[PDB]
Amino acid sequence: GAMEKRPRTAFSSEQLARLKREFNENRYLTERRRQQLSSELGLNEAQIKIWFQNERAKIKKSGS
């Protein structure tokens, strides 16, 4: 069943582990950079763009 009562990312702990280390250093990406992560964890550009779009939108504090 494709229905769920909580938001949930269709990704692995092995695969979010290296994604966390690029999100912590820059909050965005460029076309030239998308293709590096896409070759190094085997995802499409659509999936990477969206992942970096919505990780911003969960984290509303960054100023102290």
UniProtKB/Swiss-Prot annotation:
Subcellular location per the Swiss-Prot or TrEMBL entry: Nucleus
DNA-binding segment(s): 4-62
Post-translational modification: Phosphorylated. Phosphorylation may directly or allosterically modify its function.
Superkingdom in the source lineage: Eukaryota
Annotated signal peptide: none
Record family assignment: Belongs to the engrailed homeobox family.
Function: This protein specifies the body segmentation pattern. It is required for the development of the central nervous system. Transcriptional regulator that represses activated promoters. Wg signaling operates by inactivating the SGG repression of EN autoactivation.
Name under which the protein is recorded: Segmentation polarity homeobox protein engrailed
